[model samples]
Target: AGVMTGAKFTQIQFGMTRQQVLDIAGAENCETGGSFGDSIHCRGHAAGDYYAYATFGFTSAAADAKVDSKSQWKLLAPSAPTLTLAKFNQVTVGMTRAQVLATVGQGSCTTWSEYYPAYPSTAGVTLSLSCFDVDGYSSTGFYRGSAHLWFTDGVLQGKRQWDLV
Candidate 1:
């Protein structure tokens, strides 16, 4: 908030994505709708130290307005918010399932694939357990964006994710 503490804020790339934002701030937080405004923005993030504010712009009803991509992160503000990415460097390969859950927290799932809800959006922005897109060529491809965390035999296997924004 004082000054841009992390380098992630400086790395806002064009077409950058949500997961990538997570991967950067070390990984990140949120907000939602059912409320106001001309634009339909539904975001949700944790309200703790590593932040000022983060988001996931779901639907911008404004014909001329576009949902702000996290990749556009540029600076810091004590009162305002920007993508709080980076520490997710801890969420690397070879981490345990319990470890993953402890950090990102338990996520919710759909009927078939348990789309574990990490921290992010209100209108269903989150992580996955047995979701498809994270794994290469899976049937349930590209729900929101990113990775497998693809568990098999109840084990945390290798993960796969790229900036798919």
Candidate 2:
């Protein structure tokens, strides 16, 4: 699904039902969460290195409720190099670390040894964890979208992208 746009966020208004909010901003691109499960947050990557978001607050923990408050959709400055979904899609399993670097710019990563009990084929093997910040996906809570690539002996074993599809 496509990311939420500022234009659609602007279309949202307080007192509008959650479905109304979802109609303007795609429900697929939105997340519902709060201490009381009373908030709906939608976000998307925009031009340049920024992620935009709009948060809606509800009065109670009902499945359907009117928005009590809405934040002016704003941009979150990128914390890492932009990793566009288009570029992330280029990476595939079994690629080399260098190949991944060439496809998606590097971000903060660490290396360590661990047993892959889940993958019997690569059990008890050393693994390297690498990731890149995905552009245009962020939240006020802990952790936003990121690209996670796993490598074994410098050969890419698997890859995953979070937040932005």
Candidate 3:
């Protein structure tokens, strides 16, 4: 019984002017893109680089309000939240698996795949939290990101960055 319904936001597309972005994200929170007029470009850079663009989605009403609106100037919805594991600096060794689940929520799928001897001599687990439809793909694929939780004994120990590979 680890199911949750969450809202996913899409990425704002190109040609969206500063005002349009502000309307969705609010003027105070709106950020400027490095490119001439492409905010998505800026977002992608933040995630990694070109070939791999960065997109994001909301998981709550507040998050939606921060980046969605019916402004003519705005084009696409904020991108979906790829299954990337977020930065949890406080995560440390000795935390129970339940504790880790509480912080990251249950995997999106009822079942998950695991990799033994993950990393150099370290045992770990990788779970697919969700799958999303890519912009032009006809089918849904494993969410581009991942959540890698490393544990020692029955407690959570070290964690690493999980992204679409």
Candidate 4:
């Protein structure tokens, strides 16, 4: 992997359909070589800080795509302090994904249908809005719940989060 590959890894996230992840990150060094039944291991590399391997496990690929949209699901405690509303409020347009992450760490991408009038419809999407207790993976299976923020080409573009009303 090259410098760009590093960027891709930083961008490799969950909450999206597994297919979406494969499409976004590609299948170069990523593999399921020794895995089975919706488990994937990806070792993305960058020129420098690109030395992390991630494993994802899912029960249903279809269900995996919309972890946020599942109202029946409740966020026990989205306690990543850095990703709090106070930090997220500080986020602005035109900020790079890395910069935004400095404030909110990293979450997941649960939806993608907000491109409006010119592009399509309304009521935008996604729920990849939670970061880890520490850094990257602690185990398999994707984490549930988030405070959504959308990105375009690794730049901050939109934001959302689940609420109990």
lDDT of each: 0.33, 0.60, 0.32, 0.42
Of 2 and 3, the candidate ranking higher by TM-score: 2
Candidates ranked, most accurate by TM-score first = 2, 4, 3, 1
Candidate 2 overall lDDT versus native: 0.60
Model 3 lDDT tens row, 30-122 = 333454233322221111221212222121223222221111111122244222234233445577766655554433221122222233223
State the displacement of the C-alpha of residue 6, model 4, in Å, after optimal TM-score superposition: 19
Candidate 2 clashes between residue pairs 3 or more apart in a chain or in different chains: 45-136
Better of 1 and 3 by TM-score: 3
Model 3 alpha-carbon drift over 4 Å, by segment: 1-87, 108-143
Indicate whether candidate 2 or candidate 3 has the larger lDDT: 2
Q: Of the candidates numbered 1 and 2, which has the greater TM-score value?
A: 2
lDDT tens digits, residues 1-165, model 4? 331133453354435556655665566645554554445545533213333444544335454532122110121223343344456567786777677677665442222222222212223332233342222222223433235566554566776554301
Model 1 TM-score on a 0 to 1 scale: 0.26
Question: Whole-model lDDT for model 1 versus the true structure?
Answer: 0.33
Each prediction's total of clashing residue pairs, residues at least 3 apart in sequence or on different chains, is 23, 1, 12, 6
* TM-score: model 2 vs. ground truth: 0.39
lDDT of 2 by residue, 1-165 (tens): 468765676577656788888888888878886542667777776533545666766656666666655553333333355576777888888888778777776543322122333233443344544344554443333345565666665678887777634
> How do these models rank on lDDT, best leading?
2, 4, 1, 3
